[PDB]
Structure of 3C-like proteinase nsp5:
Amino acid sequence: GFRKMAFPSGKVEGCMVQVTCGTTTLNGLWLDDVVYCPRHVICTSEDMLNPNYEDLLIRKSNHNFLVQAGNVQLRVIGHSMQNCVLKLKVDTANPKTPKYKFVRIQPGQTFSVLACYNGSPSGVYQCAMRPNFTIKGSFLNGSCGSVGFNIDYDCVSFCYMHHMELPTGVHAGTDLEGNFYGPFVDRQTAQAAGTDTTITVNVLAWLYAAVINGDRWFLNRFTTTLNDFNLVAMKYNYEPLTQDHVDILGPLSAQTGIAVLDMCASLKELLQNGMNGRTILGSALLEDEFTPFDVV
Amino acid sequence: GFRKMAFPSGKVEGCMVQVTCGTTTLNGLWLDDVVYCPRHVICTSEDMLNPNYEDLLIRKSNHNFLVQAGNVQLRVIGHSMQNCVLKLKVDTANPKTPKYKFVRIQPGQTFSVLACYNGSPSGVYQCAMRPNFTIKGSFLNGSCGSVGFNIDYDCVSFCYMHHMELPTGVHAGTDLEGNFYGPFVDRQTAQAAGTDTTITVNVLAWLYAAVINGDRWFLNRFTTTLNDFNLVAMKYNYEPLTQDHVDILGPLSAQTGIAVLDMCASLKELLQNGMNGRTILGSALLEDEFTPFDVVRQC
């Protein structure tokens, strides 16, 4: 918990391509002989109020789509839709295609984002899917989109594709089968995310991290109960805690000797009172974007 | 300036190898037909207090060094020391060598770090060189080193190579010509970094970013002198502002309508009042790891 690290992006950098239809250019993902991108790329400024993606797409032809892989143009030989992602079939398969799978994550899980600006991968950052199903991303100077992923050995797990900025600085998107995370639609219309909350089990995992790293000043002699803790949590805008969360933290409790409900008592008192001038793990903020697995 | 973003690491990943000497294995950088790595790889555990690097190196021959680029073994055909870096000549140039250059940075400047854990690249993060010439990196689960860079257009600027964790959590290292940043040496003797101060010019550039994104609540009607600002800033462990910092921010004060010394007056009030509970650019802390250059790119 020293610093929020992202996975190295190299395996993903060679899958990014630019996709143009009309005036709209944005980022696509090129795997085997298929390019994936948000289906809203076929829309024009006027289509976006309330489009019929079915209709507009049947009126589209292969030569309407310009796909650039660097300075190499890819010829589109087919297209289909799968929920909110358009699949463009291309003449050539990507020789840089890594071992990969598509997965869907849950709120509270973390991943790395390779962000597009000005038509190329330009930034990488680590983040978490919020409980309101948004991502607190960087959108400055707009964007050309982004892809979220994890690396598990040689295998890349793609878990997120960006579709839109929300009125707040946050982002919403889909998994790679085009299913949205959260209660959003890919139209131009009033949409606001639900209330965000702090991800409690990650905060706990992060305090476990500090104790391992020697920061121990917040421990106290007391315990609490799930029910007593959860009533305090809801008051402070923190997610409830379940027996599953307790189970998942069990390794950290057995390694450290601090029971989970004993550490919840520490977290309970940190809410009500605060850090004063002491810091945890060199940070004076409560971090909730480190998962248990991340602390390892 | 919402998220601290790092540069995509791929051009650097193709350059990381693994140098072994005796029982020590750590990360090296393979550019053209040279491998660069910390000279202390030739050190026995006994030698770390008072190592005689010239004595230790004259006693090595080329096949003492084991260089592995993933699965391939590279063959060492010569070696030389250049300050605190070992240069290992190998018989095959790296076919993945990017356009690159070696630059020495100054404190306050930012760069991305590709961190080696368990013999391979495994994490990437963005940081600044602190004014005491250390990095608040991340040291855990058996580091094998790291390499710092910026990417501009398509050229990689390599600026940092990690050598040691200091007894604090911070890390210290050299540029790629082997000169240490700061007053450190590559021996395990008592070394302590000077006080870490806040990089005043980066906070100001951040604040300008926040005005540009429409946050204005911290602004006040006052202005200050440079010498009065610096007198107050020092009592909070903020670096002093120089005239060069003022000029460098000029672009932002033009775009924004707020003079530099106007914005300093607002920073003075923030330090005196705290943020209450409010936030700037989403942050509840004053952020000092974005440079004016970083800020003028996004804004």
